[PDB]
Design a protein around this nucleic acid. Structure first.
Ligand SMILES: Nc1nc2c(ncn2[C@H]2C[C@H](O)[C@@H](COP(=O)(O)NP(=O)(O)OP(=O)(O)O)O2)c(=O)[nH]1
Ligand SMILES: Nc1nc2c(ncn2[C@H]2C[C@H](O)[C@@H](COP(=O)(O)NP(=O)(O)OP(=O)(O)O)O2)c(=O)[nH]1
Ligand SMILES: [Ca+2]
Ligand code: NA
Length: 846
DNA sequence: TCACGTAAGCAGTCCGCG
DNA sequence: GCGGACTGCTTAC
């Protein structure tokens, strides 16, 4: 069988690698890797190594990775380029596995674990590990078993063994209702004391060493707590056993808010699922706790319980253990749907990197490009330092705030990667420059043609047409791979066999990699950073969008015989929005039998008339810029309008990036019932309260489908009833940054943000109460305004999102929450923006 | 929120300033 | 009042 690596590390002059051999067995080996770097040489010095610019290079074989690292220093001292992959472990992977890696995931030990710690005096800080670990559930992907470690005796009480029979009982039987598909997969291990529990866990850890270590908040809590707790009791020599190479290190994470403290376990790849979720899910959630996410993803959260979790083990040890098992399983269910782990394994093995590097698109792309270049015996350039500088981005047209009855939309296919491929943009394909005219001249095709020999961008860059660049070459491959999976996602959407969400992630998360490459060219840490290339992409995007805007207006003017009219109402980056009122009027709205009739008509007109006109409109631009390959593909997206015969307005814009459409068709998907397409509005902002999002969305639905009278009817009913709503559902949400920065003596300091003020108000209310939930820096909070004269002392209070507010102050908050201010700022004010733009009244006049 | 990007809207604070 | 400069936060693409 083909060999593939599991983990790889660099410790001194040795490479530590865990891998699967040809027999399918997991092996470990330490290799004295002798790396090689490159330096430019005279042409007379024959070689097979050249850089990306065709300049000859000499291969320097070093006795060890130390000599190679020191050589880079000397070359820097001299001031000459030191070419080659300076990340020696990546080069080792490239040499060891010089072929496309086809891995077997069943041989990869993926570990999903979570722990429980009873703490009567606040959150148990992993740096201290003051309190005993009384529960550990450890799922092993190879064994397909849930190994449960249960502490029976601790200074916080002695308990009886957990019952698997009771845990299997339904909730209405007093049981825990632990899923039947995992109850037979539970391995229960009771322990008389903590030392025995931890000792056995390490023996368990060494026998089944995790390759992929995951869970929820395992990196910031579970891993450092276990490491420190074992350290305090047995010493670091025993805590080092958590690594298969017996080597760890305390890693400090830097950001714009302070430093962090995690533990690096060499030989292990940690993929904390909360980090995998935040990056790959394409959602911004009010709360990122496991219970909130499980509710969103699975319509079911963690196991519910009574009283604080600090007293759960003593009061209901049965539930306490079952709660712990379910926590681990919830992550396995979320992953079975999201497939973020399998995505990471795909990306990591495709790029030939450490699996945990999938968090970094830069490192990922650097190794893809390196391996690609090495294949042709080409040598990558040395990374350089650059000052952070801004550069132009996409174009956004200022829409006229108004209702728009009939709307048809068109969008380009993966614009930026396509631009890269079409123009042939790459660090080595640069050919020169041309004198630039104002951009509006290229849009109107009145400026002189840039070149008859090179592929050009309206930013002034010229690229070779007859040679390949590594960047267009490698981005094409990943683009094509997504296209193959996208051919499966649209199926399930139209058929809705199944496949969708996973087939969605398969395609949508692949695009995150290909979209990040264009951005990478504008990041100073990318090896192939170049603002000329990065601007060439975005400027081309600006041109193409407004070029096709002009072309669509021209085509629709001559076809409708109207002259000079504006059909394109709005555009953003890769899309355009066309008013279809005039098209409908040509046939006559009375000549349509029903809603589907005019939808079928606009669909036929878009495909047979507009689309071929659009493609012709792009082929000439391709000729104008003398591009290498025509790839500006813009096809029909949405078809929107009110129901036939109704009083709905179909859609509306309030401004840039803010609009609502009543869509009947999306590409190949024809909706049985009209779907709302709402972008940018408060219904989409996670900072808007849950019950307000729903109410606003219903206000919008009535505007687009039913009209003014229905909207006013619903508004009047919502204002009369909204006080009944649960306080959490009407609470605002916001991320909490730099709390201490605006903290002066527990009271709001200068320029204190409104939500931060709510946090300080909360901190005073719970001050002295060591068991009360603490607002964490960098996390999110629920926010409620407070009526004047409230006992809390300020205009608002804020508490951790995704949770009920503590029973200490809950009754007071309910009594003093300002329903009026809440209604005006979150509901009425945005609704005023929607209706005034749509020329509608949410309240009666005369 | 730990070396993909820019564009751009709304909430709120504090400032000249008339 | 009231408008702009600014921070903070959010989304679209
Ligand atoms: N092409 C390339 N090689 C690199 C780079 N960085 C380090 N190397 C190193 C990796 C390799 O150590 C060396 C050249 O590897 P090969 O010519 O592809 N195969 P050969 O039969 O010559 O192998 P050996 O040298 O063991 O005889 O340059 C890089 O960026 N590019
Ligand atoms: N750097 C960067 N640019 C982006 C990102 N998202 C969008 N852009 C810019 C670059 C993109 O070229 C452009 C549009 O990106 P899509 O909305 O994803 N449209 P596509 O046709 O690719 O996906 P589908 O086939 O599913 O419709 O916006 C991003 O996360 N990063
Ligand atoms: Ca698209
Ligand atoms: Na696109």
């Amino acid at each position: 069988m083909k060999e593939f690596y599991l983990t790889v590390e660099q410790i001194g002059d040795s490479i530590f690698e865990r891998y699967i051999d040809s027999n399918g067995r997991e092996r470990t080996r330490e290799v004295e890797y002798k790396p090689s770097l490159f330096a430019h040489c005279p042409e007379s010095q024959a070689t097979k190594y050249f850089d990306i610019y065709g300049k000859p290079c000499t291969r320097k074989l070093f006795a060890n990775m130390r000599d190679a690292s020191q050589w880079i220093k000397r070359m820097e001292d001299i001031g000459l380029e030191a070419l080659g992959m300076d990340d020696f472990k990546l080069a080792y992977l490239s040499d060891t596995y010089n072929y496309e890696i086809k891995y077997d995931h069943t041989k990869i030990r993926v570990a999903n674990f979570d722990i429980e710690v009873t703490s009567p005096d606040g959150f148990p800080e992993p740096s201290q590990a003051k309190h005993p670990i009384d529960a550990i559930t450890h799922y092993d992907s190879i064994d397909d078993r849930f190994y449960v470690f249960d502490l029976l005796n601790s200074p916080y009480g002695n308990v009886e063994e957990w019952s698997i029979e009771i845990a299997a009982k339904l909730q209405e039987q007093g049981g825990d209702e632990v899923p039947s598909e995992i109850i037979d997969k539970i391995i229960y291990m009771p322990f008389d004391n903590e030392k025995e529990l931890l000792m056995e866990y390490l023996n368990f850890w060494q026998q089944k060493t995790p390759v992929i270590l995951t869970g929820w908040n395992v990196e910031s809590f579970a891993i450092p707590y276990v490491y420190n707790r074992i350290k305090n009791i047995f010493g670091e020599s025993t805590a080092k056993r958590l690594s298969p190479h017996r080597k760890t290190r305390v890693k400090v994470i830097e950001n714009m808010y302070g430093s962090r403290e995690i533990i690096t376990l060499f030989g292990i790849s940690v993929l904390d699922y909360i980090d995998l979720y935040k990056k790959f899910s394409f959602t911004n959630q009010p709360s990122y706790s496991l219970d909130y996410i499980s509710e969103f993803e699975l319509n079911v959260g963690k196991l519910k319980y009574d009283g604080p979790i600090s007293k759960l083990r003593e009061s209901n040890h049965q539930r306490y253990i079952s709660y712990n098992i379910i926590a681990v399983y919830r992550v396995l269910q979320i992953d079975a749907k999201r497939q973020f782990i399998n995505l990471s394994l795909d990306m990591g093995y495709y790029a030939k990197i450490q699996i945990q590097s999938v968090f970094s698109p830069i490192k990922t792309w650097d190794a893809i490009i390196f391996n690609s270049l090495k294949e042709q015996n080409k040598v990558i350039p040395q990374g350089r330092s650059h000052p952070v500088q801004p550069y132009p981005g996409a174009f956004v047209k200022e829409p006229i705030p108004n209702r728009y009855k009939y709307v048809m939309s068109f969008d380009l296919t993966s614009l930026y990667p396509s631009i890269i491929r079409q123009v042939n943009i790459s660090p080595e394909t640069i050919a020169g420059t041309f004198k630039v005219a104002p951009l509006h001249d290229y849009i109107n095709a009145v400026a002189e043609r840039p070149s008859d020999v090179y592929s050009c961008s309206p930013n002034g860059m010229m690229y070779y047409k007859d040679r390949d660049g590594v960047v267009p070459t490698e981005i094409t491959k990943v683009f094509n791979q997504r296209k193959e999976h996208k051919g499966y996602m649209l199926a399930a959407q139209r058929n809705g066999q199944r496949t969708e969400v996973a087939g969605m992630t398969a395609q949508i998360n692949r695009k995150l990699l290909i979209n990040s490459l264009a951005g990478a060219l504008g990041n100073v840490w990318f090896r192939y950073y170049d603002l000329r290339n990065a601007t060439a992409i975005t400027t081309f995007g600006q041109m193409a969008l407004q070029w096709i805007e002009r072309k669509v207006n021209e085509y629709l003017n001559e076809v409708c015989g109207t002259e000079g009219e504006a059909f394109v109402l709005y555009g953003d980056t890769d899309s355009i929005y066309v008013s279809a009122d005039k098209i409908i009027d040509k046939v006559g709205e009375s000549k349509f039998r029903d809603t589907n009739h005019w939808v079928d008509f606009l669909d036929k007109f878009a495909r047979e008339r507009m689309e071929p006109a659009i493609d012709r409109g792009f082929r000439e631009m391709c000729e104008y810029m003398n591009n290498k390959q025509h790839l500006m593909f813009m096809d029909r997206e949405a078809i929107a309008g009110p129901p036939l015969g109704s009083k709905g307005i179909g859609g509306f814009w309030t401004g840039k990036k803010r609009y609502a459409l009543n869509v009947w068709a999306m590409e190949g998907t024809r909706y049985a019932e009209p779907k709302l397409k709402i972008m940018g509005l408060e219904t989409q902002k996670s900072s808007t309260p849950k019950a307000v999002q729903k109410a606003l969305k219903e206000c919008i639905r009535r505007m687009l489908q039913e009209g003014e009278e229905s909207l006013q009817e619903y508004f009047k009913e919502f204002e009369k009833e909204f006080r009944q709503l649960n306080y959490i559902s009407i609470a605002s949400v916001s991320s909490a940054n730099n709390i201490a920065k605006y903290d002066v003596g527990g009271f709001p300091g200068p320029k204190c943000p409104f939500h931060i003020r709510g946090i300080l108000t909360y901190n005073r209310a719970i001050k002295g109460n060591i068991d009360a939930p603490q607002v964490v820096e960098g996390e999110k909070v629920y926010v409620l305004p407070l009526r004047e004269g409230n006992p809390f002392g300020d205009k608002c209070i804020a508490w951790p999102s995704g949770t009920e507010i503590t029973d200490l102050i809950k009754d007071d908050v309910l009594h003093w929450m300002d329903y009026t201010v809440l209604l005006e700022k979150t509901f009425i004010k945005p609704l005023e923006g929607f209706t005034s733009a749509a020329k509608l009244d949410y309240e009666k006049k005369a």
